[PDB]
Amino acid sequence: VMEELEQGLLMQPWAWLQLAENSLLAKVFITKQGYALLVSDLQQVWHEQVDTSVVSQRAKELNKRLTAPPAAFLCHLDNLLRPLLKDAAHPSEATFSCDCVADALILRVRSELSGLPFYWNFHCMLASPSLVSQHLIRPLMGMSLALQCQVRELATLLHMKDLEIQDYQESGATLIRDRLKTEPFEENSFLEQFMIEKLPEACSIGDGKPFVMNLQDLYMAVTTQEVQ
Amino acid sequence: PVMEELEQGLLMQPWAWLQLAENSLLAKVFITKQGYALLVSDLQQVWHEQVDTSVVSQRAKELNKRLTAPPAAFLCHLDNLLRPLLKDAAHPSEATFSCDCVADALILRVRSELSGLPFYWNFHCMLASPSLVSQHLIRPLMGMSLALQCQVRELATLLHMKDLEIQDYQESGATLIRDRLKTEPFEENSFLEQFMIEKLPEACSIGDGKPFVMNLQDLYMAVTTQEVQVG
């Protein structure tokens, strides 16, 4: 139960949330026994794990007039949230708002179910140092190392290709098209040029959209490997 | 001004590896004549300690019990003892490091033989604030990841250009003297899948954090400098 939810949250990819001009990065894991949520804004990380009793109590308090078993509530919440997180630009039906309490965060979600209002509230406390570390720092660390290894392998491939180009040029005919000529690859020169020119835009985090849009698969793979 | 300078110096400072007692940590310290700042971690928790001259003198007197020196000289000697050890490993600095994770706070004890005489210090680092740990580890790391992804994309497009040139050479009716050097066409999808299947388990491993300080410091420096320049 608890371990199941923790593992499901760990092995989930980050998703982008837009709400009242604000942006957030959210990971969600729903199950019949409860749900786990981890939200962040690149400055603070909040985590909330809720079981059957808490979800039932909160649903009764919020939806005064929605009598249903907690499992059905969890299933409906999953059906409402998962498609939105997975793909952006989805038909706008789930409105979100965030209230930043002095310590906690209140995420209010209002949606439509068969034309009827449906309210829910996530009361997220500040994430524990261990959870935030395990969810962001170590996985990001692994992705950085894996990308460094990828760059090294691609540099080796470029060295092989440059050697073979030199072999062709040493004993070969002229080029049918002269516009396809390429200069020899230098790792130091390429690194310096990239750092001087395109690092300011390449490393621009912004609001977190590029991170979720670009390299979520690597994050998922690194987290799955770390699990084992 | 002193606090802002300390924060900026700490932010610009890179990470270093400190093997102390049957364990190791990632440390980042910036010491100036008016105080110092320290950020330590073990990849699970982050502790931070910003310290000024008055408490420096107080704690130095509480610990040494026989040394009377101005706080500026004490900080200068502490920097002289620490920086060479951080910069390179296996440095015979005669510095002994111990850690005590008492309650939530962390006590990092440093002992040395200053010109053949005892010298003690203690860092009473508290749990790092959520904003500080974020700005120091999360944002720079993800900026590094994005920069490396852009580097990989650049390498892939350069591979594509080289492959186009190679196809042109082949179509030009030219034959290689030796086929032992022949290379096959490169595909981004195939290479990515092969790498993920084969080398990802070994590359993604962080262990105690040594590979990061060994290989991913210059990019960290550049990303942090860009971030501070932006705001």
| Other Cβ atoms within 10 Å of B121 Cβ, number | 19
Which alpha helices (H) appear in chain B, and where do they start and end? Answer: 2-12, 53-64, 71-87, 130-133, 139-171, 188-198, 200-203, 210-215, 218-230
CA distance A137 to A223: 11
The tokens 């982050």 sit on which residue?
A: B46
A23 Cβ contact list (under 8 Å, min separation 6): A16, A17, A41, A207, A208, A209
Residues found in chain A: 228
For chain A, helix (H) and strand (E) counts, in that order, are: 9, 7
Reference A137, options B133, B8, B126, B48; nearest CA is: B133
Instruction: Using CA coordinates, name the residue in chain B closest to A155.
Output: B155
A195 and B CB contact within 8 Å: yes
- Beta bridge mates, A164: none
Query: CB neighbours of B203 closer than 8 A, spacing ≥ 6?
Result: A145, A146, A148, A149, A150
Look up tokens 């092989």; give the residue: A160
CB A108 within 8 A of CB A97: yes
Give the method of determination: cryo-EM
Nearest to B145 by CA among A142, A160, A32, A24: A142
**Interchain CB distance below 8 Å, B168 and A177:** yes
By the CB < 8 Å criterion, does A222 face chain B?
yes
Which H/E stretch holds residue A80? helix A70-86
In angstroms, the CA A195 to CA A200 distance is 8
For residue A198, which residues of chain B lie inside 8 Å, CB to CB? 150
Chain A / chain B CB contacts < 8 angstroms: 203
Which residues touch B105 (CB under 8 Å, ≥6 apart)? B47, B124, B125, B126, B127
d(CA B38, CA B29): 4
Contact A215/B at CB under 8 A = yes
